[PDB]
Amino acid sequence: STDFNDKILNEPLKHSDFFNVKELFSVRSLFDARVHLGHKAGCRHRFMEPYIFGSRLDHDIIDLEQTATHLQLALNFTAHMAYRKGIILFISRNRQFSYLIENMARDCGEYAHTRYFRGGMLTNARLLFGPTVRLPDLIIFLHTLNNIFEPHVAVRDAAKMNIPTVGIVDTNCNPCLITYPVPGNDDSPLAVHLYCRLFQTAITRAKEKRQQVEALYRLQ
Amino acid sequence: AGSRLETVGSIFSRTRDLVRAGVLKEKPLWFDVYDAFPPLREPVFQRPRVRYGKAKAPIQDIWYHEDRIRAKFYSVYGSGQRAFDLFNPNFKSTCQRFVEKYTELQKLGETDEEKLFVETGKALLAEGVILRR
Amino acid sequence: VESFASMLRHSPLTQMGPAKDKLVIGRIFHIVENDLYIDFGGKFHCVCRRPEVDGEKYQKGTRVRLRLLDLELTSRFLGATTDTTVLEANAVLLGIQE
């Protein structure tokens, strides 16, 4: 099993961009998707200030140069977790995109939770699902806020359960406990569609790469 | 299982400490990936504070030189009767044509704001753009 | 390589300046009885009532003329440290675009 570990699970960690996620997006595409449009300054969260380019007539503009690097890191992490056959759970309480996110989760062979989040789903999972239930290895937030404009409880619960989180954070969101935050607009349908496309493509590409690498290992 | 003190350190530091301490027999599946490609900031809980006194947020206001011109335009000729098409990435409003022509005059002549304004208006009327004051 | 600063400077939304009493073009993308959800290129859509005149032509994909009042509707209430947002723009439906 040592040779298998070394060649399959440790080889991809020796490359800066193993799955070539940098070619999935650019600053131009993020701009075309309106990823830079934040909320007005009155709704600004303090911890989001380092990610804000400026305020245009009282409307926060997200710095897309930083969004590009943050998205690069988040997509790389997601691809590496999908290559390792980890359970990926998408979460979003925005009802405008529930159907889209559930379809995308079904399509990439991963999991979705867009419905009401019952207390203890993660921290009390053994009581709710069964003693041998396996929890997600990665949780992705397309929207980190619930419908009362407070953080989704899953952010804190995943932090408690030591599950890394990727998240889209708008100017009024709190990115402190998200492991791989991606500053950007989470309200425009164009932007949410772009995020779903990117994450789905990264996951499917990583899984296909895993299959190809194992096939090469067995054949050769 | 790991520590549930989400406000002490981060998931990475807690997992690493509990692994070295021997509490956790094996590292979680994400640990090696995090170690190889860490995030730009370590996800440590911080309580957001309110700014009092002379503490102002460091966010700037996005202004450009041409904004001045735009203001004058929108104050003299008003908002153009033709509508804005924000879907078109290369949309060119009447005010934007005025701005570009004014900039061309400025770079090809002297700097007198009123003279630039009137000459730009004359040239735009020459090109065939309706401009009601 | 075009940097983000250039894109923002030359963006139509940036060029528009203040959004108050600005004429924009919107697209109807969702209909709920007589409520039309119109996207005009901003962060948020605007919800407009179907006019009583020529109401049948207002269908999904239709191009409309709008007079913007506010790009996002927010207001700070007593005892609140942050603005409350309704996640919707304010605009006035004028008619169809020929």
């Binding site: 400026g54 007539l57 | 700037q60 206001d61 996005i62 202004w63 450009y64 030189h65 904004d67 001045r68 735009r70 203001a71 929108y74 | 940097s3 600063a5 250039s6 400077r9 300046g17 203040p18």
Partner: peptide, 25 residues
């Protein structure tokens, strides 16, 4: 970069309007 924003007072601000009687005795 010449495309960066510049520090400036709000150029779109409408000045406070003068009353009917200001400047008159």
């Amino acid at each position: 970069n010449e495309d960066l924003p510049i520090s400036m007072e709000n150029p779109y601000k409408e000045p406070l309007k003068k009353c009917i009687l200001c400047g008159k005795h």
